[PDB]
Amino acid sequence: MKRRPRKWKKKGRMRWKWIKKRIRRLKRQRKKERG
Amino acid sequence: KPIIPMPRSRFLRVKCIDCGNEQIVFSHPATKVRCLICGATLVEPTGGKGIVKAKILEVLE
Amino acid sequence: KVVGIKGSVSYLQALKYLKTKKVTKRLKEIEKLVDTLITLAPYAPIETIRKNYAKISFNKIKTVSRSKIGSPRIKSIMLLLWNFGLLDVKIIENSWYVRKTKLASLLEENFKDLSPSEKLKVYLLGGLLVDTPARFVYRCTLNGVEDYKGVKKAILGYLSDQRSNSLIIGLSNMLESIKFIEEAQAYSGKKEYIGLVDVAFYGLSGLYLDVKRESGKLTVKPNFRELRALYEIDKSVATGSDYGLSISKEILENLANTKRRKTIFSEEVQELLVNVIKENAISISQDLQNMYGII
Amino acid sequence: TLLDPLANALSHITNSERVGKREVYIKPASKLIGEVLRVMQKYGYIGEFEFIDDGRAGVYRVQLLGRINKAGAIKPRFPVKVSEFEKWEKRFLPAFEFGILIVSTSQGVMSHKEAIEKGIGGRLIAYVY
Amino acid sequence: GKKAPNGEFAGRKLKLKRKKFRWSDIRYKRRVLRLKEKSDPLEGAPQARGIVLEKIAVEAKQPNSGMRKAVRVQLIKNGKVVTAFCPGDGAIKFIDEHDEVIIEGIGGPKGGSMGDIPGIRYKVVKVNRVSLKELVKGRKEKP
Amino acid sequence: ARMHARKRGKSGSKRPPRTAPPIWVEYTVEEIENLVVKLRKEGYSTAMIGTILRDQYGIPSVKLFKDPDNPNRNLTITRILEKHGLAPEIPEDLMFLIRRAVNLRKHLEQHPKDLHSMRGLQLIESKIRRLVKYYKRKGKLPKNWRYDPETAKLL
RNA sequence: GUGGGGUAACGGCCCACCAAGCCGAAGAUCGGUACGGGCCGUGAGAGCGGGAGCCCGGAGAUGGACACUGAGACACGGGUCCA
RNA sequence: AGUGGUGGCCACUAUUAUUGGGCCUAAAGCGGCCGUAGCCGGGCCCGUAAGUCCCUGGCGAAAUCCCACGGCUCAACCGUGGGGCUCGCUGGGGAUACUGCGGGCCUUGGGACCGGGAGAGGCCGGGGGUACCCCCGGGGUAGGGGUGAAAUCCUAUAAUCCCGGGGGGACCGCCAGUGGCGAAGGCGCCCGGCUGGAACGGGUCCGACGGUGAGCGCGGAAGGCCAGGGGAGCGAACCGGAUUAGAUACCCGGGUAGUCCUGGCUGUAAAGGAUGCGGGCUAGGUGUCGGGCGAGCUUCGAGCUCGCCCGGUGCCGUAGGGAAGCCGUUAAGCCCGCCGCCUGGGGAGUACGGCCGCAAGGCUGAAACUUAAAGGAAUUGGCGGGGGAGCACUACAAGGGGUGGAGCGUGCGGU
């Protein structure tokens, strides 16, 4: 995981922690489907 | 802060109390200055200048 | 399943440089690692294990750099040494228990003052000379095997040949490793898992073989020039079964085709290796029966 | 750690004269520093300059006349021949023939103007204007 | 600290650093790998000859309100299909179904969609080899 | 004292810019050699030898005396030890670090969980290795010579 | 490397033996891309970009392969074979 | 006699920064340290002359380019004459200032030693404190607990509560700070044992051994994981009580993993000073910490007061810098060294691939397409279930009158 602090400004966007959790969920399911 | 650094420490020409031994000693010793003959302590190495115990005769630069 | 060594797939390529005199840092690492492993494992002879075996502390194995070596690497080298019948290793809950075999402590003693490369080379050859799974793989190659399918069919036949009780356990492990890694080596290009057939092909790569990776496959090819020397050595000291695997006519004629190569080592080393196993064939063979065989 | 006495000296001079002191002491004294100090004083930028035997590396004492605007040592010792010299005057000086540069030619450290008629190349060492 | 390396014997690193960071540029990356010349439907062609398939219009971006006429063109050269804006007043009537047409990039920012209409990349110039501007002016006649 | 701590403290010391030895000294150049060899045969290193000479004998510096055996080299206590088969083959400065490293290594053997001392070791062996490399450049040490902890135990 | 072959000619170019060399982190190998240069475009210049148009050098006759004849060719308007 | 549209290239751009950019707040210093190659390196003498510089022989074709003259009206074009390149190559002579190479000399930088003094510097053993929980005995009836309210919940087989005994795990309050120490994370009960480091004073020792650091190695908060133990309190999940239109929450009552010990893995954070490290230069003021010094006080314990020097640690502040916020010797000012990173926004830290890990995850990392801004400091209003002050009848405090109940008038919503 590389990041960019500029995202953490909440103007119009979800809290970054939850987004970073959801993307992990998607990666998990995708790798599981492949293997 | 001077342009050139001078040494603050001096030397002392010292006559001993007991046996009358004449010696040259550093102003800031690190160990106990023992006379040649009687062996008694002369200067005590402290944090700063050593604590002379004999009698000074003359300072030297 | 039984051995899922992951993340060190290419760590065993370096043995091929032992075929020549090329010297690398990696080969030096292998040399010191194997020497340390052999030194650690004692030659004592479930209660026997963890009483006159040696638990291995992974984090306590360090190079001469005060730098550690990856756990999969230590696992791979230990598993290889076992595969060549040089170390008796046992797996329990989170502990590897090692012990020096009988071929070890003899190949160790007789060659105490060789080069590290010479020491390793004689170790592999001495393991190969006796009835070891490595010997079975070498016989498979002599039959023209260059794939996992060929060796699995060969061992299926041998186990079904009613004279497999001397090495049944080790060969069962071989078949197990082939299972559940066939996909990695045949059906998925990404392998990330080295089977026992793969580590078997390595080592042979350090004597007379070259290995090519093809979308998981471990395609094999020997060279007849080098194969001739140890083929002659084996027929000179025939302390090992054929396992009912004939030499192919093609490999036979191609061995006949080439000219004689150098005898790997010096002739003194050749005769020492010959006589050491000749005079102790029974003891090492029955130790191997104890190790891989049922009874 | 110290790396180059000369550039440090020239920065010392410039920074000391921005506030506008009178007597400046440079600690790391070397021969090349003196050969440098000859040149601009020959152009009247500085007053007297002299060497003081400290006992470790010597000190250089200079009086400042308040003449120099900027005096700096070009580091990467660019070797320059004669006929292309102008290409560097546009890089370090504010106007046509304003100020000088120092070159270490085969004949020693010396001003750039005097090198044009002497017809000598060499490596640029410093500049002042 | 000081921008580095400044050494007289530092040519290798001074060159390598600049070459590396020239990749951080985007236009140079766009040129040297020529991926403009791999993603292009027009294959670096300021013109192309296509066949029209159906006329469509799009809503202008807000606050601009209206109906922007255009057509869909499959390209005889290669076969890709793209939208094609039609300029002129009432020019959609002039452009008919199944027309040989000449199409060309619309000259927006970076070649993007021009002005207040999104998505589109190209505009029409000649219809059946006849310049559309005059036909907007009515000076000529479609064959 | 900034290679590791990077702290600019200056507990250093000052010497006068003296070229000639002081007039008030009475010992001749021959007596200082006798005194230093007497101290050294007792088993004193050149640093502590010098401290004693300046402390009780009151001599500012041997370096202020010019070598009778060489007109262009200042006399040094180390050179005097060399003049009479007393100079050490391993220079004192590195020998002290060797013994410190060995004893600390014993402490770490007895205390595996002290990582601060581990780092102290990690830096003082870098000091030893740096000076070994320097001496290899200068040649005072044999080219093949390489510190090894097991050999260091012997030393 | 030794000793030989064929070449107009030296050369592993080729052959028998002998030995383990050679290259690579300063970028080998592999892949992408591409005839090199005099030059040309732009720019105050440092520089960036390009190499078709005239001259020199390199190479090719649909892809491939091969001889003869000739001082000179594997030969655009000479020859032979596969597709 | 051109003129427009479009596409490719250079400039515009110092948006590729050698000349010549930034990285505290706008994209941009990796959490920290060590260290190889490489790069950059103290002063003086002697030698060499490779680089470096001046002179000179051979050589870089023609064509193009600059200029004078001449010919075609002139021009373009052509010739006569002079000049220029990538001219990178090569023969020889001359110089020794700097770099390089060799030899010698010298300590300021760095490293090394010694004396007292300071510090939550680390590891190991022993002792011990307070509080808390459980258990036993005595007393005590009639509740306790908790909230905005209650409820769940414990309790009469004696609860809460008080006293007297037993066990247990965790942690070591105030002193405590703008204090100290540590490379950073981080480090506090007392004693003892081992161990690292710094500062101060003395160069007393080596003689440039140095700085940086691609590759490399190391240890490194909480949480999670593997194996065994342990589990007083707290408490992810979960289970109930409540609240609400809706409660998966905030609130309350319980409660597993966790939190603790031993071995190992994971390599993570707004690991922030959002400031990579070494040297030198540049007004000052102002307190404490350590060491040293000079005085005075001193019941003579650095015990106490004032000045000075060194190191670290704040604030204010001259000039200076910056878009400003602000920084301003502990620099975000001026020079000298080296590595990393940054090149509109989003996609995206994603896809694919590689490497590591037991797993979760880690280290690397695009493109298509889309958009005119994103973004930063800062001024004026508006607003706050923000604060402070002042007021107040189209407001309330106390008091009085009265509508909405019935009908009617007056005009209105709606038919």
Residue numbers in the entry:
A (entry chain B2): 1 to 35
B (entry chain BY): 3 to 63
C (entry chain B3): 2 to 46, 51 to 300
D (entry chain BJ): 2 to 130
E (entry chain BO): 3 to 145
F (entry chain BR): 2 to 156
Text from the published report:
In this study, we present cryo-electron microscopy (cryo-EM) structures of dimerized small ribosomal subunits (30S) from P. furiosus, revealing a unique dimerization interface facilitated by a novel archaeal ribosome dimerization factor (aRDF; previously known as PF0560). aRDF forms two homodimers upon interacting with two 30S subunits, establishing a head-to-body dimer architecture of the two 30S subunits. Positioned close to the platform of 30S subunits near the neck region, the interaction surface of aRDF dimers predominantly covers the interaction with 16S rRNA of the 30S subunits. Additionally, aRDF dimers directly interact with the conserved eS32 ribosomal protein situated in the intersubunit surface region of the 30S subunits, crucial for intersubunit bridge formation to initiate ribosome subunit joining. The structural architecture of the 30S dimers, along with the protein’s ability to suppress the formation of P. furiosus 70S ribosomes, classifies the aRDF protein mainly as an archaeal ribosome anti-association factor that inhibits ribosome subunit joining.
The resulting cryo-EM maps (Structures I and II) revealed a dimeric architecture comprising two small ribosomal subunits, mediated by two well-resolved homodimeric structures of the aRDF protein. A 3.2 Å resolution was sufficient to unambiguously assign the protein binding sites and the conformations of aRDF and 30S subunits. In this arrangement, the 30S–30S dimer is connected by two identical aRDF homodimers, each composed of monomers A and B, and remains unoccupied by mRNA, tRNAs or any translation factors. The analysis of the cryo-EM data using maximum-likelihood classification revealed two distinct conformations (Structures I and II) of the aRDF-mediated 30S–30S dimer. The two structures differ by a slight movement of the 30S subunits toward the central axis of the dimeric architecture, using the two aRDF homodimers as anchoring points. Specifically, the 30S subunits were displaced by ∼3 Å toward the center of the dimeric structure, accompanied by a rotation of the 30S head domains by ∼4° toward the aRDF homodimers. The head domains of the 30S subunits exhibited a lower local resolution in both Structures I and II, indicating a degree of flexibility. Although the relative positions of 30S subunits vary between Structures I and II, the 30S conformations within each dimer remain similar to each other. Monomers A1–2 interact with both 30S subunits simultaneously binding at the platform regions. Monomers B1–2 interact solely with one 30S subunit binding between the platform and h44 of 16S rRNA.
